[PDB]
């Protein structure tokens, strides 16, 4: 699976780039999946978790930090939660929350749709601050009723998208992205935020071809988008998905035409080199860097399971693209076109031929990969004869069926 | 005793409000200059300490359906009645005086306390003397004393308010004879009394015989008598005799306001007792002594400091480490911290800047997750509220901000933006040739001195010239990391730097810098026998404090 | 806004203080010489009569002394204090007069509270009294709630003295209703006859109407000359009248004669995957599978009992707390044989999981059931009172047992475990040691047939049968049930048609479950094939399903639509 042992993560930048519950979940993911660095990740997590009235997840994080500190007290041979925080946090949280509940119930008795919608959004934000997922949803799911303006609908969609990411109800995200896009007549770049929401939601839904297409349409003018995904990861997410799905012509057109992914490639020069090396047929340098970035994003919140399939697809596509211009390519040179061994490439090539889309034959005598260019006519005639034989067999079958049905032959 | 109120308390006062608004079960009606207020005797008894006697004494008032209550405002009684029917006051900022007057007349204790707490918290800039007379008219000792100290500072500050002219004799004697006058000179109180006495006629001349003797004798032998000769009624002989008697006696003693020594306020120092983390201390440039200050929250740290031209200290933001948007103000005499209106966003190390009487907080990790992370928020020292202003142009961290020529200037790694308060917009300024952060700037005269950064970079900027230039490098010992602090002192630019080496103790020394010499002359070296180590996250600011109110910090040399 | 809670109680306690300390009193209620100093405010806040007594403009509007008549001092005092402190202490005796004064004063809130209490208090011994009370005062909701409970409980008892003192209109509604639960149409006939003969000729005019609601299968046979004996002398307007009167009114059988012996099943496999489990039933005579109402709040891990009066009760169980999530609750429910719904009853003291519900002497006994306590007495055996609607603890069992079954024989509780057995003596509340089984088997069920205990199966289960005799106090083997080899039969012991039958579902290797029941010959010690349940009507039920013997009405229930 994942949970590997990799050094060199920059905790300060990754924590500061995100903000909110999005930051909290990522810090929890980093700590749980990266040992030998979990303590500082947990120490930084609990330092930020106590801010903005966390109740249930604080107990889980504090318990994990207490276990982590206890582990450090036995290897080179547990912090107090300061329960006064509970007394302080609960009394403060309740008082303002009831006062906010106080004010909104006045507006329910005053009957103003926008005021009711705005108050419930504040209640939803407060519940999210208080650490109440479903409670925030119901406030948002009853503020959706009292909408009056298109911007109010846009704000309603954004709030539901934000919550459903935490709830992992990505179906609700995609539905509200479609509602927020298709309805209002397809400087304020609002569609860019919606496209970013769809791209990450699709990627979390094990979708790659649409996620890359949506991510490539995201303009860099959005800049600060920390509640869902940092721009640095967006560029990484877009580049990996484009590499696995977009072909060479598809890659070149979309990257250049977007003119925002060029900026995204500037933030992440590593993935930019990958596509350029992918284009110029230097898959040896392309894949060695790929493993270097692998360990880094192997501890990414919504990438770790998906990227393993993405990287496997990248290796398959690179091999297909490499051998495509060659009718007879030496397997030694193809093996030398990566750090892989001769035997390992032969097994990988054999697997690719079994799956398909390489159309090649392996001459293991001299270890030379000869491309298969079978004439269309021979295969056409063979499969036409097979089709005729199958048609004759099915004709005999239906002939027998008609005979037995006309003669009323059946077991009583 | 079992006094459960879950879904049972509301039901009663739900009905009684419904019964009141529908005019049901009413047996007593209040006539208020022709306005009828049908209500109940029982609700009035539990709320007002006067209505209980209004309906219980064996007088004819008990057997009277219509009672004509006068000297009460209809609106104030109605808001009192509805508060006696729903428990909610919902008081405004204008009708507080009349509401308190009617509450005192009706002896409604709960609303009296609520109005007292509202009044004690809303003495901002102008109503101090007005409500002090209101507190003098109706005994509100807790508010009276709070207003007394508040008036003492503020009245001395303005000393031209028209509301001060009308006052009782006893209140003026308490104000004027007190030793809490925040005045650096003894003649400003003299002329304030003179203008107060010349405002009216003989009736005030009777009070002149008692108020003239509450000032130190240095101002009673002055031109006061010479100006009194033309202002005295004719055929007055004995009045002159008693005036001559007020020269020698009555214990001429120094005041307290003259002890406004210009000092340096420090925060987050190395605490002596290990049970405490940080502490706030002060240093006296002239007295060469180290004073201490009480921590405002006593548990929260990472605060920002600002000093208004009127020598006021404010604290905003910080983390307990949960971030709290609380606000506090330092008392110059009580050595305490009175909280104020909190901010709407929980900031980490905010940078507060004062300009045009408004406190501007620039940056400092607002919420971090803003759609526009580059925002600022200002404070109103008069209205006591926070007003949103134009957001920041660019994202900056560990930045500094100063005020020059009534304009807001914020400094970052290499960029600078000037905020125009009149139009509420940011304007592009000069770009610095060196990228340095983790440093602060000082607003001395018409020049901004950005000192330090990562060092000893001295980059001087002029508003009138709009250019950045180098002057020199501070003389510091090698193999060290100096902690530079630039601040104005005695109308002269000076620095406060500490050098730390390997296996060596920290040394504190301040230098005098000259504009045309580009050299930091040795002004004074702070001896370690009086000042100990401060730390790394300490901050420095300049302001006036009182040695008597504060206490010396005990520490072994 | 919601109005403030803190000021509400502070004013509320001042309402009470001004009442207990007689100060602001302007009106006093004069009731049978008892002084009631109070206020015009509080009295009419709850009462809708005092608002028309004070704010009406009559003589009392100024008069400060009112002589309230036809009321009770205790009822007025509790009503007055309830208006002042909000506490309504309702006992089991004064609720009758409480409703009388509540209706007289038209006080809406106490009327609802006492009505709800009477809805909870309706039972067998006061059904006639409450229905007449619900007829005296229009309380339609209670009247309909009573009438349904009245209809079933009259037919069972039909001997209460208050039945004689009933209005003619009420009796006509009761007798002509199609909700009566009677094994025969003759018991209602004689019940009407004794009611008519209870009094003098005042019942003669109602006799022309009461017979107009009864079927004609007894309006020509016996109990016509008996009335002629009881006829007033020389009355020639009745004997001839009834002679030519019983032509109309459409003979039709009633509904109470449709209680067939059926096997009630609980926690069956739900057909629709949206629900966890369901409840079904098998018809040994109709050969169909009728659906039943779901357990209350999908109450799983429960126990069933059927009293000799043919009543179904549910105790114990757990509800999924709001992935594994389940919390145990001690809620109790009663099943309505006609409305196809579960009426809630008084909950137990401790929560139970799979409790053994056994009825004896009218008391429902729940033995064990994985209680929450777990103390030294980790059994928590407790009986239920069907008379007072309450639970009373009984003598604890000598030993701690798990996955046990209990039956009732000879007015005694016989609970069985892996190898031990103890008999509970309800008259002295003591336990006595019984015979010891020679085989260690658990997860089985036992059925009480006559004076013998038949422990069928045990451990899947097997075909081992150990027969115990109460009079002999010994465990003996009889035979083994002939079943297909390499299978896991699910045995279910039950008594039906005055015989010991077994509901055994067997599953072969890689085969679907097959349903078949056998009749065990008591004298021949052999299981005979009584009937084979075809799979076209009965589908899979599961493993944790329970079976019990009882009677249900096919008319009120509906056939379950499901593919064979």
How would you describe this protein?
The structure is cut from a larger assembly and holds one copy of chain A (412 residues) and two copies of chain B. Chain A is mainly alpha-helical and 412 residues long. Helices cover 70% and strands 3% of the residues of chain A. Chain A is globular. In chain A, 32% of the residues are buried. Chain B is α+β, with helices and mostly antiparallel strands and 557 residues long. Chain B folds into two domains: 6-137, 2-Layer Sandwich (Potassium Channel Kv1.1, Chain A); 261-552, 6 Propeller (Neuraminidase), CATH 2.120.10. In chain B, the strands form seven sheets. In chain B, strands 27-4-5-6-28 form a five-stranded antiparallel sheet, with no helix packed on it. Chain B has a four-stranded antiparallel sheet with strand order 7-8-9-10, with no helix packed on it. In chain B, strand 19 and strand 20 (447-451) form a beta hairpin. In chain B, helix 5 runs antiparallel to helix 6 and helix 7 packs antiparallel against helix 8. The chains are: A mainly alpha (412), B alpha+beta (557). Chains in contact: A-B, A-C, B-C.
């Amino acid at each position: 699976n994942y949970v590997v042992e990799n050094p060199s993560l920059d905790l300060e930048q990754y924590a500061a780039s995100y903000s909110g519950l999005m930051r909290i979940e990522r810090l929890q993911f980093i700590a749980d999946h990266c040992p030998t660095l979990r303590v500082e990740a947990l120490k930084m997590a609990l330092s930020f978790v106590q801010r903005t009235f966390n109740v249930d997840m604080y107990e889980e994080i504090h318990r994990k930090l207490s276990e982590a500190t206890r582990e450090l007290q036995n290897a080179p041979d547990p912090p107090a939660l300061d329960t006064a925080w509970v007394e302080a946090t609960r009394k403060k949280a309740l008082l303002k929350l009831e006062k906010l509940d106080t004010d909104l119930k006045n507006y329910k008795g005053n009957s103003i749709k926008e005021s009711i919608r705005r108050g419930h959004d504040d209640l939803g934000d407060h519940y999210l601050d208080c650490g109440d997922l479903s409670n925030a949803l119901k406030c948002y799911s009853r503020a959706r009723d009292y909408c009056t303006s298109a911007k109010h609908v846009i704000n309603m969609c954004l709030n539901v998208i934000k919550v459903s990411v935490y709830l992992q109800n990505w179906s609700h995200v995609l539905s509200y992205v479609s509602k927020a896009e298709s309805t209002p007549e397809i400087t304020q770049a609002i569609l860019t935020k919606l496209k970013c929401a769809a791209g990450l939601a699709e990627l979390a839904a094990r979708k790659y071809k649409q996620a890359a297409k949506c991510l490539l349409l995201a303009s860099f003018d959005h800049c600060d988008f920390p509640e869902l995904l940092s721009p640095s990861n967006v560029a990484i997410y877009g580049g990996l998905c484009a590499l696995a799905t977009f072909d060479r012509q598809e890659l070149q057109r979309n990257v250049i035409s977007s003119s925002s992914f060029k900026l995204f490639l500037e933030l992440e020069p590593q993935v930019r080199d990958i596509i350029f090396k992918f284009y110029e047929s230097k898959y040896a340098s392309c894949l060695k860097m790929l493993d270097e970035m692998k360990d880094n994003l192997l501890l990414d919140m919504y990438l770790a399971p998906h990227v393993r399939t993405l990287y496997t697809q990248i290796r398959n596509r690179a091999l297909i693209q490499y051998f495509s211009p060659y009718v007879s390519a030496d397997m030694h040179r193809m093996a030398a076109a990566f750090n892989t061994t001769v035997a390992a490439l032969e097994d990988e090539l054999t697997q690719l031929i079994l799956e398909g889309l390489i159309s090649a034959r392996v001459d293991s005598h001299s270890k030379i990969l000869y491309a298969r260019d079978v004439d269309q006519r021979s295969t056409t005639f063979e499969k036409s004869l097979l089709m005729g034989k199958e048609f004759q067999r099915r004709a005999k079958a239906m002939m027998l069926r008609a005979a037995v049905l006309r003669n009323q032959i059946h077991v009583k | 005793e079992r006094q459960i109120n879950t879904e049972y308390a509301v039901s009663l006062l739900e009905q009684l409000k419904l019964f009141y608004e529908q005019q049901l079960f009413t047996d007593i009606v209040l006539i208020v200059e022709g306005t009828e207020f049908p209500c109940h005797k029982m609700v009035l008894a539990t709320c007002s300490s006067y209505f209980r006697a209004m309906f219980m004494s064996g007088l004819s008032e008990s057997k009277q359906t219509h009672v004509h209550l006068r000297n009460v405002d209809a609106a104030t009684l109605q808001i009192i009645i509805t508060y006696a029917y729903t428990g909610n006051l919902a008081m405004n900022d204008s009708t507080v005086e009349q509401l308190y007057e009617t509450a005192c007349f009706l002896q409604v204790e709960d609303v009296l306390q609520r109005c007292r707490e509202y009044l004690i918290k809303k003495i901002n800039a102008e109503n101090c003397v007005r409500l002090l007379s209101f507190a003098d008219l109706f005994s509100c000792e807790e508010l009276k004393q709070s207003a007394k100290r508040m008036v003492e500072h503020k009245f001395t500050a303005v000393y031209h308010q028209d509301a001060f002219m009308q006052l009782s004799h006893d209140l003026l004697i308490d104000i004027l004879s007190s030793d809490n006058l925040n005045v650096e000179k003894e003649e400003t109180v003299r002329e304030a009394a003179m203008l107060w006495l010349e405002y009216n006629t003989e009736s005030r001349s009777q009070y002149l015989s008692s108020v003239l003797s509450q000032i130190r004798i240095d101002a009673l032998s002055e031109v006061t008598q010479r100006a009194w000769f033309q202002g005295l009624p004719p055929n007055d002989k004995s009045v002159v005799v008693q005036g001559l008697y007020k020269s020698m006696p009555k214990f001429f003693k120094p005041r307290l306001g003259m002890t406004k020594e210009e000092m340096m306020i420090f925060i987050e120092a190395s605490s002596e007792n290990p049970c405490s983390l940080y502490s706030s201390v002060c240093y006296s440039p002239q007295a060469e002594k180290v004073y201490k200050l009480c921590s405002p929250p006593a548990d929260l740290h990472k605060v920002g400091t600002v000093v208004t031209p009127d020598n006021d200290i404010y604290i905003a933001g910080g983390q307990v480490f949960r971030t709290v948007n609380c606000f506090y103000w330092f008392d110059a005499q009580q050595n305490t911290w009175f909280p104020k209106t909190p901010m709407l966003f929980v900031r980490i190390k905010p940078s507060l800047v004062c300009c045009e009487g408004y406190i501007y907080a620039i940056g400092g990790d607002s919420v971090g997750g803003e759609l526009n992370r580059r925002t600022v928020e200002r404070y109103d020292t008069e209205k006591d509220e926070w007003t949103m202003v134009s957001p920041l142009p660019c994202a900056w961290q560990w930045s500094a901000a100063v005020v020059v020529h009534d304009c807001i200037y914020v400094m970052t790694l290499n960029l600078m933006y000037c905020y125009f308060p009149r139009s509420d917009s940011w304007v592009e300024m000069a770009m610095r040739q060196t990228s340095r952060s983790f440093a602060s700037a000082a607003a001395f005269g018409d020049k901004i001195f950005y000192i330090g950064g990562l060092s000893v970079t001295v980059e001087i900027y002029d508003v009138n010239k709009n250019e950045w230039k180098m002057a020199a490098n501070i003389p510091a010992k090698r193999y060290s990391d100096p902690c530079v602090r630039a601040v104005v002192i005695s109308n002269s630019l000076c620095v406060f730097m500490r050098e730390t080496h390997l296996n060596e103790r920290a040394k504190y020394v301040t230098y005098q810098y000259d504009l045309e010499l580009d050299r930091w002359s040795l002004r004074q070296h702070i001896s370690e026998r009086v000042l100990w180590d401060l730390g790394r996250d300490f901050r420095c600011t300049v302001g006036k404090l009182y040695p008597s109110c504060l206490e010396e910090s005990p520490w072994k040399p």
